[PDB]
Design a protein around this ligand. Structure first.
Ligand code: HEM
Ligand code: DBE
Ligand code: DBE
Ligand code: DBE
Ligand code: DBE
Length: 444
């Protein structure tokens, strides 16, 4: 198995992975094709790209390509003392049944709409915001309100959002060496989790001390608190509930937050797309129906802008797995213990599949191009096959709900040069580099 160039010998490509992971992965493809390798210290990473190789990846059962130990940076976050022994598929199943059922979508759209109005309540006539600060906080509220419950969300304040952020900043790729290296970002990460457990414990004690007289406001915290082990003792501790809540929201927070920011960035970068979306929204809402109604149904132009934003700026730039056995892909041998990865960042821009891959072209999703549909295994912002993101429908609905409100009320423009808006790839969790100042003005 040949490796990409530039390896720093002993450390391999670890340092490049911590600064320019996309450049590294792209060089692996440019140099080795659909199957190449790079190393993170002693760990071997087999990087797959292209339709054939990606299909292998996405059709692989968790018994051949395990997600289990593929993301060591998450263990200290969900919590060591956790019973996350539920197959990643079991987890997806529980989350779905609890908060992602189709019949729940309309209520979620209304919740999200409400949360957005609450966030822009004091915006006034005009001003400026930082995209990361705004969307990171907004999605903490939409996520908690929808996935856990409005009652729970209402018991939260800025502290929760700030601590959660420290969790995401605690995902330095060095976790592939040791998730407990004595570095400050990992220390802040561990303190942040203890801070979150404390906030939840406080709320828990309040729920237990004064049981909800109502019942129609009952949320996921109430549900978890009531569960009893066979011995008859409460099944979950504040620590486990916190871990479960963190897990419920993690995959959906930074992805939705970053996607909302980039959707607005691309709209502002392309004046004609922006105009097209504004006219579409105006016409659409002119029928007098609600956001909860329209956000669940098609909004063509805004959706093609979202699909293109996702193709160019996928929030998860690399998907990881650990080979549980011996495999072979296009002649390249994969060994047990090897890390195996797929990359939306790289695959979403393969020129043979997506002409002019670096250009923003929403029309590539209209007929007859329908590039997302004709390139199932390479258009993968949400993954594909059995590992397709379980929150996709929710994420799509949220984006529509969020912008239906924002773009109908305010108009935005960059407060910085267009090139200044970019991602920070120093942690496994991608987020906008700051500042990302944007000016807003109430629409007349
Ligand atoms: C535009 C935003 C989103 C993008 C592009 C995205 C992307 C992805 C991708 C590519 C994966 C599979 C990664 C892998 O195989 O390791 C994934 C998994 C997952 N996504 Fe999403 N996602 C988004 C929003 C959300 C939302 C809003 C939710 C929650 C309602 C969510 C919940 C999940 C879950 C539960 C998993 C599996 C990880 C776990 O069990 O903790 N995603 N997502
Ligand atoms: O960055 C590393 C590192 C560890 C292994 C390797 O091959 C290259 C670099 C690091 C960070 C903090 C420490 O305390 C010790 C090593
Ligand atoms: O509702 C849940 C649940 C909690 C967290 C999560 O990420 C998914 C589902 C639940 C209910 C009863 C149980 O015994 C255990 C979990
Ligand atoms: O946020 C995650 C994540 C990883 C495992 C999990 O159970 C939930 C979320 C992530 C971050 C960076 C990546 O490259 C891939 C996934
Ligand atoms: O069909 C979509 C889709 C993606 C964005 C949008 O605005 C509407 C539909 C899709 C494709 C593949 C996935 O894995 C998840 C959703």
């Amino acid at each position: 198995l040949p490796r990409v160039s530039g390896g720093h010998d002993e450390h391999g490509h670890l340092e490049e992975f911590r600064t320019d992971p996309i450049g590294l992965m792209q060089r692996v493809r440019d140099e080795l094709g659909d199957v190449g390798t790079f190393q993170l210290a002693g760990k071997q990473v087999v990087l797959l790209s292209g339709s054939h190789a990606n299909e292998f990846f996405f059709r692989a059962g968790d018994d051949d390509l395990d997600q289990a130990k593929a993301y060591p940076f998450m263990t200290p976050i969900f919590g060591e003392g956790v019973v996350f022994d539920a197959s990643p598929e079991r987890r997806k199943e529980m989350l779905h049944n609890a908060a992602l059922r189709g019949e729940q979508m309309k209520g979620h759209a209304a919740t999200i709409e409400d949360q957005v109005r609450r966030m822009i309540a004091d915006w006034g006539e005009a001003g400026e915001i930082d995209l990361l600060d705004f969307f990171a906080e907004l999605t903490i509220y939409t996520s908690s309100a929808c996935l856990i419950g409005k009652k729970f969300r209402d018991q939260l304040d800025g502290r929760f959002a700030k601590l959660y952020h420290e969790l995401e900043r605690g995902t330095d790729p060095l976790a592939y060496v040791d998730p407990y290296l004595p570095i400050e970002s990992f220390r802040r990460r561990d303190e942040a989790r203890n801070g979150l457990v404390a906030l939840v414990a406080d709320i828990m004690n309040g729920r237990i001390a004064n049981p909800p007289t109502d019942k129609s406001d009952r949320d996921m915290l109430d549900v978890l608190i009531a569960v009893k082990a066979e011995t008859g003792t409460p099944r979950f501790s504040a620590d486990e509930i916190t871990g479960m809540f963190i897990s419920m929201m993690f995959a959906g927070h930074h992805t939705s937050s970053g996607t909302a920011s980039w959707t607005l960035i691309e709209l502002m970068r392309h004046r004609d797309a922006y105009a097209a979306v504004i006219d579409e929204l105006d016409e659409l809402y002119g029928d007098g129906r609600s956001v909860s109604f329209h956000a669940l149904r098609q909004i063509p132009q805004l959706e093609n802008v979202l699909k293109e934003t996702l193709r160019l700026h996928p929030p998860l730039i690399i998907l990881m797995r650990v080979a549980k056995g011996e495999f072979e892909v296009q002649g390249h041998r994969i060994h047990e213990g090897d890390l195996v990865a797929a990359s939306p960042a790289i695959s979403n821009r393969i020129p043979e599949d997506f002409p002019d891959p670096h250009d923003f072209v929403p029309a590539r999703y209209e007929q007859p191009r329908q590039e997302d549909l004709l390139n199932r295994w390479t258009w993968i912002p949400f993954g594909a096959g059995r590992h397709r993101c379980v929150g996709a429908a929710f994420a799509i609905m949220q984006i529509k709900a969020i912008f239906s409100v924002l773009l109908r009320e305010y108009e935005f423009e960059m407060a910085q040069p267009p090139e200044s808006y970019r991602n920070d790839h120093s942690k496994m969790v991608v987020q906008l580099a700051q500042p990302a100042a944007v000016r807003y003005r109430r629409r007349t």
